[PDB]
Amino acid sequence: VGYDDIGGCRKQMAQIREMVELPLRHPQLFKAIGIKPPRGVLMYGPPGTGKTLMARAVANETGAFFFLINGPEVMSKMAGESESNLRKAFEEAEKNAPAIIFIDEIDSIAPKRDKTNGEVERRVVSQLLTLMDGMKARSNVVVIAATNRPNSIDPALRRFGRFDREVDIGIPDATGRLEVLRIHTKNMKLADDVDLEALAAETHGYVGADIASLCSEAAMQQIREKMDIDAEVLDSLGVTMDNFRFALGNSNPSALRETVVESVNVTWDDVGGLDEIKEELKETVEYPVLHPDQYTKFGLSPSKGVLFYGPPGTGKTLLAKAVATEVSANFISVKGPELLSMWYGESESNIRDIFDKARAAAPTVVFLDELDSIAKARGGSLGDAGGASDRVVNQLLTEMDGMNAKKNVFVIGATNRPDQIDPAILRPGRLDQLIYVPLPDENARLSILNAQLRKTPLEPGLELTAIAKATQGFSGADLLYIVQRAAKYAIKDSIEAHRQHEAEDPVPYITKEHFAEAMKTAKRSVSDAELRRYEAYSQQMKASR
């Protein structure tokens, strides 16, 4: 390993390389300036980013002594033996030559010394403090530490003299992922068709090891394509671009591996009608994520939130599924009342965790189904559980708009009762555009009928214009019910025909008779009361005009 292995973090490579080499190559220059250089550094960031890789690279390149300490390794069973091990390690490092200590997973050996209740750990941390600073603290040695939770360290340890400089090895950028891909594809044999720039563009949240996993999976796919051993096949493997596309369509970022959504298969042509709303959604989701130069040219941040509201079954969850399946950004599908818990504060803890994942693996889209379940009005409930719902809605308000970074979080809410939402959520900045999804008209009902009948054989003379003209107040769900009834009658006809045939293909299409006699029980789901309620809500929204 070397400096050509660690990729995507130029600043951190330069900072650590200078800090570790320059005071060990030109000490006279630092005697000329007068001050000593920083001597302790803590690398922190999400897992699988390159902290241990950087430590390995430094150990391999720098010719000085290198001593490695895994966290738990220091502790032992006999009393006062762990501190003896730490003292022995420091003495061995100091005595022979100028050296670099590397402490991997410092969180195991450096608790907060305030929430812990043990004894040996508190003496081991105190011994570490004395060794790092005090009478005869340390000479011509440097200390590197690696951690995943920098907040789990006692602050007394993170002061100048012990760990003065904090390097943040975080998630890469598009250029960083491209560079990492170029590093990881430097040894395999690739076909000419592969284009790493597009692949890096579509890898929206992959960090470090994620890229390596993707490459490995692609290679394995290639291995299992040309294995259905002679050198003829040993040579000319040729990892195609299709292999990479398949591996990218299969893998997901490890951060979201906890909340991976089930693979539902819908497409945009499955959504009948609502063409302008579909284009609006496309415009609001794909522009910030693909074209940031123009947004920075105008010097404005993009619009993020959106709220669908309308009668039930008009297609809100259908739009959400379409977004989940046919968009490059990651998807976090979150249920309404799933995030609540019996304990005290665990609802807001879960909400914070979900939004932390969303902001970590950005660009990300989070779908809030039935927003009125967790985000209702505040203080209306007299008999409550201690105002837990109130705290939940306040947590949502601060998390969607607070002391955050506003990098890329797209919140879509879907509720059919837009009067029960807290007005503090409807203001621009959190859910800034409210899209009404009205009942389909005739040209939308025909489109819907084609959308759900695109995988169904029908009689050639079956025209759907009559069905569209005949359904007036129906919704997409009602048209779905009509087609389902027609199909079930067709199935019944097929079954009885087969029974007749075996008594001693019968039906290849849905007949006009099947549709006509399945249209007997057709029904409009939304009553006039609900329709008038939604119309009044829209007219009250327009009353401001």
Partner: peptide, 23 residues
């Protein structure tokens, strides 16, 4: 010679309940 020993006993949590009013 002496020896050390580890111990992890328990923890205690707090729950939240819902009540019903009669207007």
């Amino acid at each position: 010679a002496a020896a050390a020993a580890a111990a992890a006993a328990a923890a205690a949590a707090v729950a939240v309940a819902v009540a019903v009013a009669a207007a």
